[PDB]
């Protein structure tokens, strides 16, 4: 009736200040005896109402890191995204929690969840050039880089551009998947702009991707002055 109430409040964003203060004080007083499937029900509820507390989040993160095997895969993804949304950072939680998602990689529904986990891990101020678990996630995304979509490609391009990640095979896969997506007219100009931007920053030619995405990518960045027909005919006379 505290975890249930907190989850019910955080699922609809009706934070009540003093009541939540008393709730936090209570769950701080008795914290060492919270069973699993209740930390997940309170972290999301208290993070969806935008409460920035340090001691409470520290305690909940430590408790969740202690009990890792009980949480299933989707619970792991949601618990990472909950911390990721606000911007708070916890090294122990991420380090202990990405190992399970790396070991149980094969049970993921597709690579979109993998790129979402990588993005949420980036948002938490965790080094993405760390131990080979992130490398395993990236290689798995590369091997099955056919289920990606516009949003996943955009987020991954943002992560690579910000983090300065030199790992090329995923960039080649991104270029090829952008080409294939444009082949069926199911891409957005912003995604083309982002992939062209990361390609230009990382100095990869990939003429096939450069050719067919140029018209889509130039239509968002090129600022065009609206000219009247008289100036149009003057230009026609000029050139």
């Amino acid at each position: 009736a505290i975890s249930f109430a907190i989850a019910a409040f955080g699922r609809v964003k009706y934070l009540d200040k003093k009541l939540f203060d008393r709730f936090t004080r209570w769950i701080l007083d008795h914290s060492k005896d919270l069973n699993a499937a209740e930390l997940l029900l309170t972290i999301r509820g208290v993070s969806r109402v935008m409460l920035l507390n340090d001691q409470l989040y520290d305690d909940l993160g430590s408790k969740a890191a202690e009990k890792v095997k009980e949480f299933p895969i989707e619970s792991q993804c949601v618990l990472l995204s909950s911390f990721g949304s606000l911007g708070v950072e916890h090294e122990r939680l991420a380090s202990r929690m990405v190992s399970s998602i790396a070991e149980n990689r094969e049970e993921l529904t597709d690579a979109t969840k993998a790129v979402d986990v990588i993005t949420s891990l980036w948002s938490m101020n965790y080094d993405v050039e760390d131990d080979k678990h992130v490398a395993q996630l990236a290689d798995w995304v590369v091997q099955r880089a056919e289920e990606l979509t516009d949003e996943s490609i955009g987020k991954l391009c943002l992560v690579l551009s910000d983090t300065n990640w030199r790992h090329v095979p995923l960039v080649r896969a991104i270029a090829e998947q952008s080409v294939r997506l444009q082949g069926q007219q199911s891409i957005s100009p912003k995604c083309c702009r982002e992939v062209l931007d990361v390609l230009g920053t990382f100095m990869i030619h990939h003429q096939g991707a450069r050719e067919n995405l140029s018209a889509l990518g130039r239509s968002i960045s090129k600022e065009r002055i609206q000219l009247s027909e008289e100036e149009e005919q003057h230009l026609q006379l000029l050139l």
């Binding site: 200040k17 203060d21 935008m50 409460l51 920035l52 507390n53 911007g87 609206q226 009247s228 008289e230």
Partner: protein, 452 residues
């Protein structure tokens, strides 16, 4: 022990403002935003420049002043952290700290002016127009900044770099700012002229209004604007009709064909007249002198229908304009007199004396407004100038008012300002009237001062 994440709060406030502005604005969104933002407090967090300007902008938008904690906390970090402000976020802060009445809300602007004065050269078109629009509303009159920005605008306008949406903003901001320059306005007019057929009527009338508001200009400019106005009369409603008609009247050039076509097209939308801007289109005729009676009767016929909307200024200006071309139609005049008597509580000195003078001119005197205006005159007789005092005194004279409490202050004021009172030749006959109506008994000093 518990705060709110100010960055996500700013994002939610941005979404709330976007939803409130684009849907109609039910007060629920305003109350929700105020409730959320009241508890928000910038603190030992590390908000960057954008996340502070966004919060300040939304807070001022949703009806907050220096009373709120957030506004006071957000006006700081700008007093002390000035280098963080960039050209992208300068107009937001500058126009946010404009309607605020705090002293600290007027120092910030000063600093911004300096940081713009040396940077009016290294800007593009959009930044220049945004900065000019932001600084127009505040009210500062830094001359060096305006000179630099005028130069930059002139340089940018040499080769076409302004879409047909920023010329209106620039002209309106300069006209409201009360700063005049032949070269800048000529360049703006030329650039607007180059973009033929791109400027619609909805984007043309405001330019004419802005140019007319600085009407101290030369011909050959409104001459060309008359040509363009020929083909934009069809698809425009009564509001721009009246506004551009007042603008052309203030230009001071007789456009017989333009006035004729405006009169011809104006009668179709006589129904759309809300009687609020009828005062301007009536007064502009008095300003120029055109006495076409057909549209005058058409306007007067649409009066009783809408009188509640009429305000004190509207009634005063309408009666003053109707003084010339005196129809003296009692049916409208009784209702207008009663309505103005109800409104007579809120009025203006100069307006008070014009209303009294016009009522005396029309020779329609009823007890209610007469006594009401005589009562309300005393509070404003203190500050009227010579001719205005004379007109008010003659208005009371026509009103047949003998109450000592009313005549004593005006007589004292005219005694203290006898030299200017007796120095007006055009009003001379008027003074004549007053004494031979009243007599010599009231003010003996005025007696022997006149007899001199």
């Amino acid at each position: 022990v518990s705060h709110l994440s100010a960055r996500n709060i700013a994002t939610e406030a941005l979404q709330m403002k976007k939803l409130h502005q684009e849907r109609g604005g039910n007060p629920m969104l305003a109350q929700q935003a105020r409730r959320v933002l009241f508890a928000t407090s910038i603190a030992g967090q590390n908000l960057d420049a954008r996340s502070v300007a966004l919060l300040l902008n939304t807070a001022v938008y949703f009806g907050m002043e220096s009373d709120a904690k957030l506004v006071r906390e957000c006006i700081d970090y700008c007093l002390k952290n000035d280098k963080l402000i960039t050209v992208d976020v300068l107009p937001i802060v500058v126009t946010a700290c404009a309607t605020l009445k705090s002293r600290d809300a007027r120092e910030v602007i000063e600093m911004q002016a300096q940081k713009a004065a040396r940077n009016a050269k290294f800007l593009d078109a959009k930044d220049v127009t945004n900065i000019i629009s932001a600084f127009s509303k505040t009210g500062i009159n830094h001359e060096k900044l305006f000179a630099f920005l005028s130069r930059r605008v002139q340089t940018l306008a040499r080769v076409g770099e302004f879409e047909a949406a920023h010329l209106v903003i620039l002209a309106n901001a300069f006209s409201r700012l009360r700063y005049r320059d032949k070269f800048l306005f000529g360049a703006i007019a030329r650039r607007a002229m180059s973009l033929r057929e791109r400027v619609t009527v909805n984007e043309l009338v405001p330019l004419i209004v802005a140019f007319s508001k600085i009407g101290l200009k030369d011909p050959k400019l409104s001459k060309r604007f008359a040509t363009k106005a020929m083909e934009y009369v069809d698809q425009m409603n009564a509001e721009q009709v009246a506004s551009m008609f007042m603008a052309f009247a203030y230009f001071g050039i007789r456009y017989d064909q333009l006035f004729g076509v405006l009169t011809n097209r104006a009668v179709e939308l006589i129904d759309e007249f809300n009687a609020q801007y009828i005062s301007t289109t009536l007064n502009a005729f008095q300003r120029i002198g055109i006495n076409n009676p057909e549209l005058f009767d058409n306007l007067a016929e649409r009066a009783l229908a809408v009188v509640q909307d009429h305000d004190a200024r509207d009634i005063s200006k309408t009666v003053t304009a109707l003084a010339h071309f005196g129809l003296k139609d009692e049916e409208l005049f009784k209702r207008l007199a009663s309505h103005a008597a109800s409104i007579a509580d809120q009025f203006d000195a100069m307006g008070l004396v014009n209303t009294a003078h016009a009522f005396a001119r029309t020779n329609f005197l009823q007890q209610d407004m007469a006594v009401a205006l005589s009562e309300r005159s005393v509070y404003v007789c203190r500050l009227l100038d010579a001719g205005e005092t004379r007109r008010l005194l003659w208005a009371l004279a026509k009103f047949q008012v003998r109450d000592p409490k009313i005549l004593t202050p005006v007589f004292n004021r005219c005694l203290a300002l006898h030299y200017d009172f007796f120095a007006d030749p055009t009003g001379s006959e008027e003074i004549e009237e007053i004494f031979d109506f009243y007599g010599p008994n009231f003010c003996p000093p005025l007696y022997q001062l006149y007899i001199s």
